[PDB]
Design a protein around this ligand. Structure first.
Ligand SMILES: O=C(Nc1ccc(Cl)c(C(=O)Nc2cnc3[nH]ccc3c2)c1)c1ccc(NCCO)c(Cl)c1
Ligand SMILES: [Cl-]
Length: 290
C-alpha cells in the first residue's frame, strides 16, 4: 500500500525510534491501507536526517514488510515514491508496555487501576506467541524487553523495536565508545561474552521480560548490581562453578512459573525452552497456579 502524506493529518508526537520519529495521525478516507477518522502511527525521518539514516530507514521498511502476526507490529503502508519517506503502522492506544504496566498494581484478593494475575499471564502469553512467530521466520529480535512492546485495546500486545537511544531507557543499555550498545541486563551470557544473538538468546531475554511483567515493571533486572557486576555474572555462567546469580522470584510469581523462567536462563542454549513451549505453559499450564 502506497499512501500520500497529504492525506495524513498529524496530531501529536508519540516518541522516537532508532531511525525516525513517530506521530499520531488521522486518516479520513482510509480505503487503501492494509489494516470517526482512522488513527494510525506514522514514522518519518528526523529533521536532521543524514544519508545514512535514510539508508537505515529503507532497510527497516524491508524488515517490517515481512512481519505479519497479531502480536507483532504491522506495517499498514509506506508513503509514495515522490513523498518524503514514511512508515505507517497500527496505533497502539495504550503505548509503551513498561509505562503502561508501571501504572498498575496487582489486584488485592480481598479489598488506582489494577491488573489480575491471569491478565499478567495473558500479556506474557501474547509476547511468547509473537516470539514464536518470529522464530518461524528465523528472525532474531536482539532487544526483547517490555520497553519495546506496545499495548492496544483490552491488553492486546504487539512486539516492536524502538532502538537503543531513547533517553527514558538510557540506563537499560551499556555504552562503550566505538562499540555496539548492549542491553546487558536482558542478555544471555554468551551474548555478553561473544556478542552473538540467536533465537536461544531471545528466549533468555523473554525470561527477563516475563520477570519484568511479573514485577509490574517496577524494578530494573539485577537493579542493585552495577553494569560491571552484570557483565562479570556472564563470566560466572561461562566458568560454570555455581557462582552465577539469577533474577529473584517476583512476589506475583508462583514457584511453578519461576522454574519456567529459570529454564530460560539455562547455561546451555539448547536446554532453553522453545517459544512454542513457553506459550503453551503461559496460556494453559500456568492457569492451575491461579
Ligand atoms: O517497530 C518497529 N518499527 C516501527 C515502524 C513504524 C512505526 Cl510508526 C513504529 C511505531 O513505533 N509505531 C507505534 C504504534 N503505536 C504506538 N503507540 C504509542 C507509540 C506508538 C508507536 C515502529 C521495528 C523496527 C525494526 C525492527 N527490527 C529491525 C532491527 O532488528 C522491528 Cl522488529 C520493529
Ligand atoms: Cl539485584
Amino acid at each position: 500500500v502506497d499512501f500520500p502524506r497529504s492525506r495524513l493529518r498529524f496530531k501529536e508526537k508519540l516518541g522516537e525510534g532508532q531511525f525516525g520519529e513517530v506521530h499520531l495521525c488521522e486518516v479520513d478516507s482510509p480505503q487503501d491501507l492494509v489494516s470517526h477518522p482512522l488513527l494510525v502511527a506514522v514514522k518519518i525521518l528526523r529533521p536532521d536526517a543524514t544519508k545514512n539514516a535514510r539508508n537505515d530507514f529503507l532497510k527497516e521498511v524491508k524488515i517490517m514488510s515481512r512481519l505479519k502476526d497479531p502480536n507483532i507490529i504491522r506495517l499498514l503502508g509506506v508513503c509514495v515514491q515522490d513523498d518524503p519517506l514514511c512508515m505507517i503502522t497500527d496505533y497502539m492506544e495504550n503505548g509503551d508496555l513498561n509505562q503502561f504496566l508501571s501504572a498498575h498494581q496487582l489486584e488485592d484478593k480481598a479489598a488506582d487501576p489494577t491488573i489480575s494475575y491471569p491478565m499478567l499471564l495473558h500479556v506474557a502469553a501474547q509476547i511468547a506467541s509473537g516470539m514464536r512467530y518470529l522464530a518461524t521466520l528465523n528472525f532474531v529480535h536482539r532487544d526483547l524487553a517490555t520497553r519495546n512492546c506496545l499495548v492496544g485495546e483490552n491488553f492486546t500486545i504487539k512486539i516492536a523495536d524502538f532502538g537503543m537511544s531513547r533517553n527514558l531507557y538510557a540506563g537499560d543499555y551499556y555504552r562503550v565508545q566505538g562499540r555496539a550498545v548492549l542491553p546487558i541486563r536482558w542478555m544471555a551470557w554468551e551474548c555478553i561474552l561473544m556478542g552473538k544473538f540467536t533465537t536461544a538468546s531471545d528466549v533468555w531475554a523473554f525470561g527477563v521480560t516475563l520477570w519484568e511483567v511479573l514485577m509490574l515493571c517496577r524494578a530494573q533486572p539485577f537493579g542493585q548490581l552495577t553494569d560491571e557486576q552484570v557483565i562479570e555474572n556472564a563470566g560466572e555462567f561461562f566458568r560454570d562453578q555455581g557462582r552465577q546469580v539469577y533474577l529473584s522470584r517476583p512476589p506475583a510469581c508462583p514457584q511453578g512459573l519461576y522454574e519456567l523462567m529459570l529454564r530460560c536462563w539455562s547455561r546451555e542454549s539448547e536446554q532453553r525452552p522453545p517459544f512454542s513451549q513457553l506459550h503453551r505453559f503461559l496460556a494453559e499450564d500456568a492457569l492451575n497456579t491461579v
